[PDB]
Amino acid sequence: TKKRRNNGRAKKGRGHVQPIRCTNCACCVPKDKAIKKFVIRNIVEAAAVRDISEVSVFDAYVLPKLYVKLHYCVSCAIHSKVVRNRSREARKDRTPPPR
Amino acid sequence: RPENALKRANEFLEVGKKQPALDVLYDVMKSKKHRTWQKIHEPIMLKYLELCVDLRKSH
Amino acid sequence: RVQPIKLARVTKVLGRTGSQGQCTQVRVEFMDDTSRSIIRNVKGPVREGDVLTLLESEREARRL
Amino acid sequence: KKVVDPFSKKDWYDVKAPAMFNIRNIGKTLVTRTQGTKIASDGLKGRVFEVSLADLQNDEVAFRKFKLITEDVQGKNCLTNFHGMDLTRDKMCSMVKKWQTMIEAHVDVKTTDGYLLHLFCVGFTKKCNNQIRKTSYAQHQQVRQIRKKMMEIMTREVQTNDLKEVVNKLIPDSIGKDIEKACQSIYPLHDVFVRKVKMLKKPKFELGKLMELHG
Amino acid sequence: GRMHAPGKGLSQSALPYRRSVPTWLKLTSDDVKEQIYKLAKKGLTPSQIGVILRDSHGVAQVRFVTGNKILRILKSKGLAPDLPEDLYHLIKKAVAVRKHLERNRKDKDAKFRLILIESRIHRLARYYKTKRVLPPNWKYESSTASALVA
Amino acid sequence: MGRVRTKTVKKAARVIIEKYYTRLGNDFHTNKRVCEEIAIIPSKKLRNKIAGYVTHLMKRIQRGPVRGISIKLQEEERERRDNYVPEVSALDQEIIEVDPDTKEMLKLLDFGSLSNLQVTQPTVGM
Amino acid sequence: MPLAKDLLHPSPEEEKRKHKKKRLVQSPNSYFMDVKCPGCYKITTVFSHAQTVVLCVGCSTVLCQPTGGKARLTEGCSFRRKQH
Amino acid sequence: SLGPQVAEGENVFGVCHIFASFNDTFVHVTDLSGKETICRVTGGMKVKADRDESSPYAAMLAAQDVAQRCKELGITALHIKLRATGGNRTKTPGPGAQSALRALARSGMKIGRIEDVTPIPSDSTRRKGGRRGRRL
RNA sequence: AAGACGGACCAGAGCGAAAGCAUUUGCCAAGAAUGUUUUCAUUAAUCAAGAACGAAAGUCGGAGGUUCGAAGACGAUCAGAUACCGUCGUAGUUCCGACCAUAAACGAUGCCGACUGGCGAUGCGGCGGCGUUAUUCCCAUGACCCGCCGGGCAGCUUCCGGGAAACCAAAGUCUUUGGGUUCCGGGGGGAGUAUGGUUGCAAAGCUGAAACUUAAAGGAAUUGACGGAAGGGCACCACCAGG
């Protein structure tokens, strides 16, 4: 049987799609069958900002943000626990956890 | 607020009728932006920007 | 590269961590500049307050 | 195996923004001593200075990295000319977001000066006054049409208003709002932002204008 | 059931139950046919004639005005399109793909649709060959496709 | 950490409270000797845990009814305070601003009131 | 519904909301209108879903703006089917 | 070639061009054009370890020695140019990016401005790896 | 400079018969939806044959080779790795014109038509609104909201019904057994092998067995147990610090 209904993510309204590698394993998975991830993150992360912002002189400019769109293969999403094993009743859930 | 009065620094340098159209709408924004008491620097700031309001024949 | 010894007192134990839960997370506020608050770890068992003789604030001792 | 002391051989060159920037002297660069045994005039006047506006204007912004070719170095002073302004990555990828129509416009447009410029743009949609849709899209027909006005006004204002006046339009996006306003009867367009300025042609004949840029 | 076309929607109108349409201004047979015979002189399809009979005039169709429809009027006149007008646009559809196929030897869409359009022709035109509408000895052909449209 | 109170103390102490809330107090050696007097506990140490948890309960229940145990002197007094009169269910909302369809329901009920208006900035509810 | 109803004469909104070929009695609601625009000196019969221009001679080139849906009007007019 | 007019008292800017990558963290400050670098110091210049060249502690050694020679040579302030690998690659900086900027802040080189300098393709040319890759 | 590719935007979305389709822009004819008192007057349906198309690698011949990269080889990996790994790299990838005709071309799910339940979206077109926004001097625009219509993508939801269950408004209206038309299976193998046909340049593709072998094969689901599956707690027969 279908262990997954959407099989990672559905491909309905699309006969065929483009594939993607893993961002950390370079493994070929389809675009709408993989795990995507946006990352909005400071370039000035909290290890340095206690010393950067004090030496940031002539700097009334706000902290910049890095914008990274990640895409994993399923094999390196699970072992790294980007996604992980949930119950099959939880496998119905299309819900991403909040950031 | 070191940038809001310094908005109109380059708003006024880059002029040509798009900016005095825009710069009225900046000062519409700049008024309740940083919703504070007009202490001194807002009589410094807003009396440059409300001055820039009344100059340009605004709304 | 090189920096002198900093006496940062414990403000708060932040936990007992590590593989065995024995590496004591500690908020050592800098004790000299009251805005600087660094976070280091302690190998041994600490009850709070005691001035920890940080030879460095570099190589930041964080969660493990 | 081999090190030198080249800091007995560098000369400081006062990097000058034009006088349409209220900070002209951007900074100083220890350029290696331009001479017969060591020619460095090409790494002096071929210097493109990639500086953000904060040290250029005196501060409306601290993004928007202008590229600055030095048309003439005049006595330890790198009197720069404009090359290409940006909207750099943190400012640039902030506006990029899912569930909007990302609207783009690349143009290649000659200045009234002798400079061919490229101008690439970006645009985005809004969730309007009463909109309950999560996203913000339209028909692709409106998507094509907004790009046509966006290329049009961008080719227009840079064909006019010779190179330094292109610099003196686009910091609050003089091309920007009119693309929103002319489309506001169709779509009011919360973003128009010209981002990639690439100088395609750069003749040095504006040395008097370089003295009009500066001083 | 549509194997002739991939559609599942609607291209056809509704018609009211009454044969007395519109019963406020029923412009006569002479009103519609002298318009029709001028439009037959102008040479429009009944699909095009019946639209301009509908919207311009005070009447909608000639099946409510007369007993005959337009092609029935055109047959009773004798001045009628010698191929069915819907079949004529079917043959018109194939030439437009074929010329486009004559332009693009790479448009694989135009290679597939020209099969189905002519298959829609070969199932339609065959029927008119039977009932003495098309001559049955005549047969559709890509040579005769552009010949009938031109 | 340890010797936390199981089912046997709490179930036994609950019956003791609701019957003896006068003769129970907050002193242990009272309530330990009261649980000598009023209860048959097969150990002194069990009586220590019961009557001590009675002192735990009596301190709680003299702050009113706490969760998991209540006395009808406290319970019915809630109902005696639940004679509360908030209205007369006639404000008067005689003619005031109501919905225009409630007005139309009032039109079907022949009284009428002031009607809401202005479908404006839709969704009405957003 | 409680799945027990019979509407031999239903309300005229549940058929009238349907498509014209999806009705209980399939008769369209598209109709003729009579155009009172002053661009013509006359009143000209135009179908609702006209799909095409309808003009006159009392006007030169405008009596209606065409529309594949119900036809676009200029300056306001009357309209009457009449009797569909 | 000492400083321009003084080596302290003015903010004559150098630009960081810190190519923070995996297995090295280059701290490599140029002139404002970029053509003329000073202080060719890698993160593994200080600790040639070949597994710790991008590590935070070795970059603190690397950035501060650059930060030493910058304020030695009249460059007293730095525009932060913290670069990842960039391009059609992993485009992710190493661990020697947080501590080293903190280190040069502790060293004394001023920071006026912070801006992102990482290049990303439009999905350009092909990536290293076959279909399977390192299978997990 | 080279050649590659348009990320992110980019979705239970669109279009397209599928195989499919992500820079702009243009050309080209196409196709869907919708609306349609237009027209044809039933022309309809489904489908052996037959035909188109049909990923990829392969091959045919080039360009192309930036990038990568079966092979290939090391560096490392392991008892063994040729593998993963690191390095370099051939064919290939790139693309043209050919073959190929295959794919898990999978939705593991004939077509068409009918009938049987609740909701909320979204792409689309048309419509309903003292709806908002929006421009010109405002309308007519459009953005958008509520509503509707469809044909969508689908989703959620319920003794709708079924099903071995899994699940499914279809995998319902079946023993109360019949809409129509096409396709296919008769326990498990041997075996798509043999055999011949057959194509393809080949690679291979297609049609398609027997001897013999067997009382089980299979499917869901329950329950354990296991995991170099994952998430919880505790013991100095477990650690730590230790003696």
Which domains are delineated in chain A? 1-99 (3.30.1740.20)
Alpha-carbon gap, residue H18 to D84, rounded angstroms: 23
SS3 labels along H27-84: ECCECCCCCCECCCECHHHHCCCCCCCCCHHHHHHHHHHHHHHHHHCCEEEEEEEEEC
Nearest residue to nucleotide I148, by CA–C1' distance, is G17
Contact H118 A51 (CB under 8 A): no
Q: What does the DSSP 8-state code read for residue F66?
A: P
Q: Which residues pair with H26 in a beta bridge?
A: H19
User: Which residues in chain D have Cβ-Cβ distances shorter than 8 Å to B15?
Assistant: 168
Whether the CB of B21 is below 8 Å from some CB of chain D: the reply is: yes
In angstroms, the first-to-last Cα distance of chain D is: 47
Helices (H), A23-98: 49-55, 74-78
Alpha-carbon gap, residue D31 to D76, rounded angstroms: 10
Alpha-carbon gap, residue D99 to H23, rounded angstroms: 38
Task: Give residue limits of the domains in chain C.
Answer: 1-64
Give chain G's length. Answer: 84
Coil, helix or strand for D165?
helix
Alpha-carbon gap, residue H124 to H131, rounded angstroms: 18
Alpha-carbon gap, residue E10 to F31, rounded angstroms: 89
Sequence-distant (6+) residues with CB within 8 A of E80 are E71, E74
DSSP for chain G reads --S----SS--TTTTTTS-TTSSSS------EEEE--TTSSS-EEEETT--S----SSSSS-S-B--SSSPB-SS---------
List the one residue out of H59, H29, H56, H30 whose CA is nearest residue H44. Answer: H59
Distance from CA of D130 to the nearest CA of F (A): 6
Place of tokens 């992360």: A45
Alpha-carbon gap, residue H32 to D86, rounded angstroms: 16
List the one residue out of E3, E74, E83 whose CA is nearest residue E37. Answer: E74
Structure tokens belonging to residue B20: 């005095």
Place of tokens 């859930």: A93
List the one residue out of E142, E113, E139 whose CA is nearest residue E125. Answer: E139
Coil, helix or strand for E65?
helix
- Are E58 and E95 spatial neighbours (Cβ–Cβ below 8 Å)? no
Alpha-carbon gap, residue H62 to H45, rounded angstroms: 7
Alpha-carbon gap, residue A4 to A33, rounded angstroms: 12
- Are H73 and H1 spatial neighbours (Cβ–Cβ below 8 Å)? yes
Alpha-carbon gap, residue C38 to C3, rounded angstroms: 15
Chains D and B touch (3+ CB pairs under 8 A): yes
List the one residue out of H131, H24, H1 whose CA is nearest residue H72. Answer: H1
What is the H or E stretch that residue D11 is in?
Answer: strand D10-16
Alpha-carbon gap, residue D75 to D13, rounded angstroms: 8
The CATH superfamily assigned to G1-84 is Ribosomal protein S27 (2.20.25.100)
DSSP for D99-116 reads TB--EEEEEEEE-SSS-E
**Best D9, D11, D12 residue to mutate vs chain H (most H CBs within 10 Å):** D12
Domain membership flag for residue D3: no
Q: What does the DSSP 8-state code read for residue F76?
A: H
- Are F41 and F8 spatial neighbours (Cβ–Cβ below 8 Å)? no
Contact H61 C1 (CB under 8 A): yes
Helices (H), chain B: 4-13, 18-32, 41-55
Structure tokens belonging to residue E76: 């009773």
- Are D34 and D75 spatial neighbours (Cβ–Cβ below 8 Å)? no
Burial class (CB in 10 A: 0-12, 13-18, 19+), H34: middle
CA dihedral (D26, D32, D36, D42) in degrees, to 10, reads: -50
CA dihedral (E93, E95, E100, E103) in degrees, to 10, reads: 180
Structure tokens belonging to residue G50: 């006209």
Sequence-distant (6+) residues with CB within 8 A of F119 are none
- For residue F91, give Cα distances in angstroms to E42, F83, F96, F115: 79, 19, 10, 18
Alpha-carbon gap, residue F81 to G68, rounded angstroms: 72
Coil, helix or strand for H23?
coil
List the one residue out of H84, H99, H24 whose CA is nearest residue H54. Answer: H24
Alpha-carbon gap, residue C17 to A55, rounded angstroms: 32
Alpha-carbon gap, residue E35 to E29, rounded angstroms: 9
Place of tokens 């399809």: E45
What is the H or E stretch that residue C52 is in?
Answer: strand C51-54
User: Which residues in chain A have Cβ-Cβ distances shorter than 8 Å to H112?
Assistant: 56-59
G40 marked among binding-site residues: yes
Q: Which residues pair with A37 in a beta bridge?
A: A70
Nearest CA in chain C to H95: C59
Query: What is the interface size between E and G, counted as CB pairs within 8 Å?
Result: 60
Instruction: Please tell me the number of Cα atoms within 13 Å of B16 on its side-chain side.
Output: 17
Alpha-carbon gap, residue E26 to E14, rounded angstroms: 20
- Are D120 and D206 spatial neighbours (Cβ–Cβ below 8 Å)? no
List the one residue out of E150, E128, E131, E86 whose CA is nearest residue E140. Answer: E128
Alpha-carbon gap, residue D59 to B11, rounded angstroms: 11
Query: Is any atom of nucleic acid chain I found less than 7 Å from the CB of residue D144?
Result: yes
Coil, helix or strand for B11?
helix
Place of tokens 């985005």: D124
CA angle A63, D196, D107 (to 5 degrees): 150
Task: Supply φ then ψ for residue H77, to 5 degrees.
Answer: -140, 155
Query: What is the interface size between B and D, counted as CB pairs within 8 Å?
Result: 46
Alpha-carbon gap, residue F77 to F104, rounded angstroms: 44
The count of other CB atoms within 10 Å of the CB of residue G13 is: 8
Query: Is any atom of nucleic acid chain I found less than 7 Å from the CB of residue G79?
Result: no
Whether the CB of D178 is below 8 Å from some CB of chain B: the reply is: yes
Burial class (CB in 10 A: 0-12, 13-18, 19+), D107: buried
Alpha-carbon gap, residue E19 to E41, rounded angstroms: 28
Chains D and C touch (3+ CB pairs under 8 A): no
Alpha-carbon gap, residue A86 to F49, rounded angstroms: 44
Tally: H helices and E strands in chain E: 7, 0
D192-199 and F97-98 strand pairing: unpaired
Structure tokens belonging to residue H84: 């990842």
Coil, helix or strand for E126?
helix
Alpha-carbon gap, residue E79 to D134, rounded angstroms: 60
Alpha-carbon gap, residue C46 to H87, rounded angstroms: 48
Give chain B's length. Answer: 59
Helices (H), F1-126: 7-20, 28-37, 44-61, 72-81, 100-107
List the one residue out of E107, E75, E116, E110 whose CA is nearest residue E96. Answer: E110
Considering only residues 39-68 of protein chain A, which place a Cβ less than 7 A from any atom of strand I? 67
Tally: H helices and E strands in chain H: 3, 5
Coil, helix or strand for A68?
strand
Contact H57 C1 (CB under 8 A): no
Sequence-distant (6+) residues with CB within 8 A of E5 are E116, E120
Sequence-distant (6+) residues with CB within 8 A of E64 are E18, E19, E20, E21, E22, E26
Helices (H), chain A: 49-55, 74-78
Place of tokens 């060159």: D13
Structure tokens belonging to residue E93: 């559809």
Query: Is any atom of nucleic acid chain I found less than 7 Å from the CB of residue E70?
Result: yes
Coil, helix or strand for C55?
coil
Alpha-carbon gap, residue H112 to E79, rounded angstroms: 89
Sequence-distant (6+) residues with CB within 8 A of D116 are D108, D109, D110, D199, D200, D201
CA of E122 to C1' of I20 (A): 29
- Are E121 and E87 spatial neighbours (Cβ–Cβ below 8 Å)? yes
CA of G63 to C1' of I39 (A): 26
Assigned fold of H1-136: Nucleotidyltransferase; domain 5 (3.30.420)
List the one residue out of D20, E18, D30 whose CA is nearest residue B9. Answer: D20
Structure tokens belonging to residue D196: 């990639």
Alpha-carbon gap, residue F61 to F56, rounded angstroms: 9
Alpha-carbon gap, residue D198 to D210, rounded angstroms: 19
Nearest nucleotide to E116, CA against C1' atoms: I52
User: Which residues in chain D have Cβ-Cβ distances shorter than 8 Å to F123?
Assistant: 130, 132
User: Which residues in chain A have Cβ-Cβ distances shorter than 8 Å to C36?
Assistant: 50
Q: Which nucleotides of I are covered by protein (CB under 7 A)?
A: 3-26, 28-47, 51-54, 66-70, 84-87, 93, 97, 107-109, 111-113, 117-118, 121-136, 140-146, 148-157, 165-168, 171, 219-221, 229-231, 239-240
Alpha-carbon gap, residue F70 to F57, rounded angstroms: 10
Q: Which residues pair with A29 in a beta bridge?
A: A20
Whether the CB of D99 is below 8 Å from some CB of chain H: the reply is: no
- Are D154 and D175 spatial neighbours (Cβ–Cβ below 8 Å)? yes
Q: H99 — alpha (psi -120 to 50), left (phi > 0) or beta?
A: alpha
Give chain E's length. Answer: 150
Cis amide bond preceding F92, omega within 30: yes
Alpha-carbon gap, residue E18 to E62, rounded angstroms: 13
**Amino acid at the residue E85:** E
- Are D22 and H30 spatial neighbours (Cβ–Cβ below 8 Å)? no
Give chain F's length. Answer: 126
Query: Is any atom of nucleic acid chain I found less than 7 Å from the CB of residue E129?
Result: no
Place of tokens 């220590």: F48
Sequence-distant (6+) residues with CB within 8 A of E143 are none
H95-134: b (≥16 Cβ within 10 Å) or e? bbbbbbbbbbbbbebbbbbbbbbbebeeeeeeeeeeeebe
Distance from CA of H131 to the nearest CA of C (A): 36
List the one residue out of B10, A54, H9 whose CA is nearest residue D54. Answer: B10
Coil, helix or strand for E127?
helix
Distance from CA of D61 to the nearest CA of A (A): 8
G59 marked among binding-site residues: yes
Alpha-carbon gap, residue F74 to F120, rounded angstroms: 53
Which domains are delineated in chain E? 26-80 (no CATH), 81-150 (1.10.287.10)
Task: Give residue limits of the domains in chain G.
Answer: 1-84
- Are H28 and H40 spatial neighbours (Cβ–Cβ below 8 Å)? yes
List the one residue out of G50, H99, E98, F59 whose CA is nearest residue A48. Answer: H99
- For residue H76, give Cα distances in angstroms to A58, D59, D76, D201, H96: 13, 20, 19, 35, 22
- Are H44 and H24 spatial neighbours (Cβ–Cβ below 8 Å)? yes
Contact D94 A67 (CB under 8 A): yes
Coil, helix or strand for D17?
coil
Alpha-carbon gap, residue A24 to G39, rounded angstroms: 71
Alpha-carbon gap, residue D66 to D50, rounded angstroms: 6
Residues 17-76, chain F: which have Cβ within 8 Å of D? none
Distance from CA of B39 to the nearest CA of D (A): 23
Q: What does the DSSP 8-state code read for residue A23?
A: T
Query: Is any atom of nucleic acid chain I found less than 7 Å from the CB of residue A3?
Result: no
Alpha-carbon gap, residue H23 to H39, rounded angstroms: 19
Distance of CA C63 to the CA centre of its chain: 11
Q: E126 — alpha (psi -120 to 50), left (phi > 0) or beta?
A: alpha
- Are A22 and A73 spatial neighbours (Cβ–Cβ below 8 Å)? yes
